[PDB]
Amino acid sequence: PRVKGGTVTRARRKKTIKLAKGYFGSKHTLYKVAKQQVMKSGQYAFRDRRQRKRDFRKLWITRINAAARQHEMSYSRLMNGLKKAGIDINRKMLSEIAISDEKAFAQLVTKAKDAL
Amino acid sequence: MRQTFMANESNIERKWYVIDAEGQTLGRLSSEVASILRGKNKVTYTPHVDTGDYVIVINASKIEFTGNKETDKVYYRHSNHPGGIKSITAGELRRTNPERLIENSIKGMLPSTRLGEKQGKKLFVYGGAEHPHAAQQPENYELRG
Amino acid sequence: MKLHELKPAEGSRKERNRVGRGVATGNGKTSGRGHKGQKARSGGGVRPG
Amino acid sequence: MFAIIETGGKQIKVEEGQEIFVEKLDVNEGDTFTFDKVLFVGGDSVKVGAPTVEGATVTATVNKQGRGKKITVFTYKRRKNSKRKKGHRQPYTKLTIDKINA
Amino acid sequence: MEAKAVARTIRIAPRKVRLVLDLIRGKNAAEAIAILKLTNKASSPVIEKVLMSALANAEHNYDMNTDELVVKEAYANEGPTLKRFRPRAQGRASAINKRTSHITIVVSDGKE
Amino acid sequence: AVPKRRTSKTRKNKRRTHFKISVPGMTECPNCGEYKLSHRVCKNCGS
Amino acid sequence: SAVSGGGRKPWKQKGTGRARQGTIRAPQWRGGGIVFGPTPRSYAYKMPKKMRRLALRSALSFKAQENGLTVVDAFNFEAPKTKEFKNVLSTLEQPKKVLVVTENEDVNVELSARNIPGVQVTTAQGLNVLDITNADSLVITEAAAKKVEEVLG
RNA sequence: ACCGAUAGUGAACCAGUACCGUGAGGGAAAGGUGAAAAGCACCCCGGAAGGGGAGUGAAAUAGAACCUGAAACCGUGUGCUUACAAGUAGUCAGAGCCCGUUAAUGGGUGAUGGCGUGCCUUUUGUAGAAUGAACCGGCGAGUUACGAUUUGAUGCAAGGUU
RNA sequence: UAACUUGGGAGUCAGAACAUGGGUGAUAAGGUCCGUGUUCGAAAGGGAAACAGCCCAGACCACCAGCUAAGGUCCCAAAAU
RNA sequence: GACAAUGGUAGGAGAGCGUUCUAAGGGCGUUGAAGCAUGAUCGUAAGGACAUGUGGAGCGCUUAGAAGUGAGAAUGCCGGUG
Ligand SMILES: [Mg+2]
Ligand SMILES: [Mg+2]
Ligand SMILES: [Mg+2]
Ligand SMILES: [Mg+2]
Ligand SMILES: [Mg+2]
Ligand SMILES: [Mg+2]
Ligand SMILES: [Mg+2]
Ligand SMILES: [Mg+2]
Ligand SMILES: [Mg+2]
Ligand SMILES: [Mg+2]
Ligand SMILES: [Mg+2]
Ligand SMILES: [Mg+2]
Ligand SMILES: [Mg+2]
Ligand SMILES: [Mg+2]
Ligand SMILES: [Mg+2]
Ligand SMILES: [Mg+2]
Ligand SMILES: [Mg+2]
Ligand SMILES: [Mg+2]
Ligand SMILES: [Mg+2]
Ligand SMILES: [Mg+2]
Ligand SMILES: [Mg+2]
Ligand SMILES: [Mg+2]
Ligand SMILES: [Mg+2]
Ligand SMILES: [Mg+2]
Ligand SMILES: [Mg+2]
């Protein structure tokens, strides 16, 4: 019973090409090179989803420290006093308070300054 | 995914300043000026778009250098022709074209990417006078840190 | 018992592995031989003893 | 109106009346489920507090305990020949907050 | 309406009547024969033979007015190629591809 | 004296962009019903 | 081996700039040569003589111990009438698959019932094991029923 | 439980034929309109080839290079986008403008920021300036018989077996 | 928390750099040859500007959560002018 | 509910999808089969579906067998196109 590769192939390569759209030029039209580029695109995808957790708590550190020294407090003396204040808040909140609504953060900086 | 305030064009304001180039010794000034241009003291900092705000430096001749580097710290430039390093500007460059003395030394502090060299154009240095930007309403900031 | 639902013996049919049919079988590209040398060539094998 | 609640381990800003995605919390669809762990119940007069602030964030009703969009992990080591790929879909339970109790 | 007329095997190459055909699209069809009559290219009458043969289908068939039409589209696809040999040096041959070309214009009043 | 690289489908089309042909003068005769080429005389024109 | 042609060595070796290709009928040409074809062989093994009866006493005991068996007395008719047997299959009702068994021969029962779909007429010493579980209904004469225990037990 | 036109004999097709060799001898490619020829009467541009109507036919987008028609590749107007820019071409953030889904934490485009030297063989080690691939299809590599030893299965038991 | 006895199935017999005890070399080598450890080979991440072998530490996957190691805290670039 | 374990080459050990044919049972097919193109859907992978076009006649699904069974590299072979 001789069996040849009848459409176990072209029904397989047209879910790589269709899964690889919008690449430049001739890496979205043809298999043997565009199999490589999707094959790196997972290898990036596993890598950089460990950068969004290394980038956004690098963003918030800027926009807190930009707002901490608008009240004569550097960032380093702030969260020392904030931890002694017994405040278990994140940074992403402490951003989002200090950019929409100053008057909340206007007294939050006091409580950390008053523990010191 | 979650919420984080990503400020935008037509969501950001930009204002102006004036710094007097008094006896701060060119690093103590031209470090802190670079953090002003990147908006890094303003709270609504989103790095993928250009925040920040303009800076005019006015008198630009009261710059000094401690130590004996008034004749050292030589500058260089290559013309891409052979034999063409032009060391003819020592660090005593203040006697002629002193505007290019600090306007070099902010564009080294800023990143050289395709947004930073746009952002380096938000700087102005003037000779010794008052600025010709009277029709712009600058303010004063003079205490750098 | 009946034809259309016959079930085999209880741990008696094991299917034989085709060797050298993909990198994700555990026998990929070299199919159990090694890299080079006497054993890895076709038809090679020393006389026993 | 303005409060800071927490679950999973992370923290979620409320903007009272809205609907926020959050991960799998156990009681079923359409019921009444509340929180109790408020680290900051602000509002018109902010009342910052201790490990808790002793004020219950109000019960949000539960909708749609389905699973997230499919993400595709795929890694490999370069020239020595290896492959891994496997699918992954993460659950989420959205919920509409309705009020607040300071 | 939109009348059209093709020629289905023309002896010239596609890339060489791609020049003159990409020069008369979207013009007044009355003088459009005269642009083809006043060059000196290869198939400048051969397109002109077809474009005369497309106006003459806009009379007996569709009764559109031959006042002044307008050419919406004109293009030329690759035809079935002919493959030959030619000997050059040290016993080796090198193939010569005598290509062929379809040709297709459409002519229309524009209005519906 | 060979190529090192097949030129892609961008520097094929970007290279041939200064390879065109322009129309000639095409001033009409007064009584030909036919367009002569400028500074020329046809065979069956008002030229 | 057995394809025609191939003694030529087409390219030489060093110098030409093609592969190191050997003949014209190597397997990776579009010519013949198949490296691992099917050798004409035979498909036949055997069980021991005790196991070879224990299946067969288990096949028809699957019928009798649950759901279906019928023993009829003998029946003769000389002229071959197909219609006089399809008559009989629907009186004592059986489904479409049905197996009749004569004792050693039948000049008519082997020669009637040979047209109907779903009927097999097998002499009691030709009792194999596929059909006896392919069918659903044993209908046997009473003369062979006493013999099959006297020959399988 | 043999193949269905790169398979099957080399050879389904006016095959050991074209074709190459002085010779002995090598040795290909090439199947399919429809149910039936009903194989496009006539009208029109063109010298003709072709073509637009009309007409046969369930279908001519089935027109004698003829069923089905995929990829490389060469083209046609288009929605977003590009002429101060340093680039293994992506990925993750994210603005603005256009479209509305197997209705789901929606699809396409991307001004700007982080992050970053393809794949396989071979190696003490490779982006490697080490080798291999122009690209897209199709074909193409642990098989069978006979034995020997081993675990897993199933009959019988001091007996088992042709 | 292993060890050993028996029986099926192999792969390796081209290693490398650091840290130290040594021969050879010229107290020369990214040299060669032994001992003994680590890591790479067969290990991705963070630091050493980039950099298989040095310094921390071992990736089952998700999340816009917190502490910390090696190295750092004027700017490019997170944090003390 | 716990409790621990899950980098990985040569190589050893398990569980798996898909392709062609047969046996048995049970079906879908001119009110449109197999292939072909397009799509935002489902499973942990290989993969499985469902609508819509084109297509004109022979296919699936469960159980169980037998193998000419899977393609990206061999300066591979042949046919096309740059
Ligand atoms: Mg194949
Ligand atoms: Mg292995
Ligand atoms: Mg491989
Ligand atoms: Mg070996
Ligand atoms: Mg090898
Ligand atoms: Mg070796
Ligand atoms: Mg050999
Ligand atoms: Mg075919
Ligand atoms: Mg012939
Ligand atoms: Mg009709
Ligand atoms: Mg196409
Ligand atoms: Mg560079
Ligand atoms: Mg090795
Ligand atoms: Mg190179
Ligand atoms: Mg090459
Ligand atoms: Mg040494
Ligand atoms: Mg050692
Ligand atoms: Mg180890
Ligand atoms: Mg680095
Ligand atoms: Mg940098
Ligand atoms: Mg593992
Ligand atoms: Mg194994
Ligand atoms: Mg089939
Ligand atoms: Mg290939
Ligand atoms: Mg070559």
What is the distance in angstroms measured between the alpha-carbon CA of C17 and the sugar C1' of J70?
14
Flag if C29 and D83 touch (Cβ within 8 Å). Answer: no
Distance F5 CA to ligand 14 centre (A): 11
Pairing of β E96-98 and β D32-33: unpaired
* Structure determination method: cryo-EM
Q: Which chains touch C (3 or more CB pairs under 8 A)?
A: D, G
> How many C-alpha atoms does A9 have within 13 Å on its Cβ side?
4
Q: Which residues are within 8 A (CB) of B120 and not within 5 positions of it... i.e. 6 or more apart?
A: B37, B106, B107, B110
Token pair recorded at residue G100: 């009749």
Residue C18 DSSP class: P
User: Please, which residues bridge with residue E108 across strands?
Assistant: E2, E70
CB-proximal positions of chain J, under 7 Å: 8-15, 18-21, 23-25, 35-39, 41-48, 62-72, 74-78, 80-82
Give phi and psi for A72, each to the nearest 5: 55, 35
Distance from CA of A99 to the nearest CA of F (A): 47
Continuous segment of H or E residues that includes residue E53 = helix E44-55
Residue B89 is encoded by which pair of tokens?
């500007």
Q: Which residues surround ligand 1, an ion (CB under 5 A)?
A: A 5
Test mutation, A26, A29, A30, chain F, max F CBs within 10 A: A26
d(CA D92, CA D63): 10
User: Cβ contacts (< 8 Å) between D4 and chain A: which residues?
Assistant: 89, 93
State the distance between the two ends of chain B, measured CA to CA, in whole angstroms. Answer: 36
H or E stretch covering D19: strand D19-20
Residue C45 C-alpha, separation from nearest chain G C-alpha, in angstroms = 21
Q: Which residues of F touch E38 (CB under 8 A)?
A: 24, 26, 35, 37
Listed by start position, the domains of chain E span 1-112
Q: For B64, how many CA atoms within 13 A lie in the half-sphere containing its CB?
A: 7
CA distance D45 to A101: 12
Cβ contacts of residue B50 below 8 Å, gap of 6+? B115, B118, B119
- Give me the residues paired with residue D74 across strands: D85
Phi-psi region of E63 (alpha: psi -120 to 50; beta: other; left: phi over 0): left
Closest nt to C26 (CA→C1')?
J11
CB distance from F24 to chain E under 8 Å? Answer: yes
End-to-end CA distance of chain A: 86
Phi, psi of D71 (to 5 degrees): -105, 155
Q: Which residues contact E43 (CB under 8 A, 6 or more apart)?
A: E10, E12, E16, E17, E20
CB proximity B8 to A under 8 Å: no
Residue contact D48–A108, C-beta within 8 A: yes
E/F interface, count of CB pairs below 8 Å = 22
Give the domain ranges of chain D. 1-102
Q: Which of A46, A89, A111 sits opposite D73 (nearest CB)?
A: A46
Nearest CA in chain E to F35: E34
Residues on chain C touching G133 (C-beta within 8 angstroms): 1-3
Task: Decide: CB of E76 under 7 A of nucleic strand H.
Answer: yes
* The G119-123 sheet, strands edge to edge: G70-72, G138-141, G98-102, G119-123
CB B34 within 8 A of CB B110: yes
**Does F34 sit within 8 Å of E34, measured CB to CB?**
yes
> Which residues 42-71 of A interface with strand H at a CB distance below 7 A?
44-45, 47-49, 51-52, 55
**Residues of chain A contacting D, Cβ within 8 Å:** 39, 42-43, 45-46, 86-90, 92-93, 96-97, 101, 103-104, 107-108, 111
DSSP D41-85: E-SSS-EE-SS--S-PPPPEEEE---B---EEEEE--TTTT--EE
Interface of E with F in 2-41 (CB under 8 A): 19-20, 23, 31, 34-35, 37-39, 41
CB-CB neighbors (< 8 A) of G62 in chain C: 1
- Answer whether G114's CB lies under 8 Å from G121's CB: yes
Which fold, E1-112? Ribosomal Protein L22; Chain A (3.90.470)
Minimal CA–CA distance to G81: which of G120, G54, G113, G55? G113
Range of the domain at A75: 1-116
**Resolution reading in Å:** 3.9
Q: Which residues of D touch C24 (CB under 8 A)?
A: 83
**Separation CA A55–CA A59 (nearest Å):** 6
Residue B104: partners with Cβ closer than 8 Å, 6 or more residues away = B75
SS3 B122: helix
Cβ contacts (< 8 Å) between B47 and chain A: which residues?
A: 59, 62
E82 touches chain F (CB under 8 A): no
| H or E stretch at A84 | helix A75-84
DSSP B15: -
Structural domain count, chain A: 1
To the nearest whole Å, the CA of D90 is away from the closest chain C CA by 27
> D85 — contact with chain A (CB < 8 Å)?
yes
Q: Under an 8 A CB cutoff, do F21 and E41 touch?
A: yes
Which residues, including other chains, have CB under 8 Å from residue B136's CB and lie 6 or more apart?
Answer: B16
Give the Cα separation of A9 and E55 in Å (integer). Answer: 49
Domain that holds residue B65: 1-145
Q: Are strands D47-48 and D10-14 parallel, antiparallel or unpaired?
A: unpaired
User: For residue C2, what is the nearest residue in chain G, using CA coordinates?
Assistant: G133
Q: Which residues contact B76 (CB under 8 A, 6 or more apart)?
A: B85, B86, B87
The whole-angstrom distance between A16's CA and the closest CA on chain F is 22
Q: Name the closest ligand to CA D81.
A: 3
Cβ neighbours of D46 in A, within 8 Å: 103-104, 107-108
Shortest distance between the Cα of A62 and any Cα of chain D, in A, equals: 20
- When divided into structural domains, chain B yields a total of 1
Q: Do chains G and C touch (3 or more CB pairs under 8 A)?
A: yes
Q: Of E16, E26, E21, nearest to E36 (Cα)?
A: E21
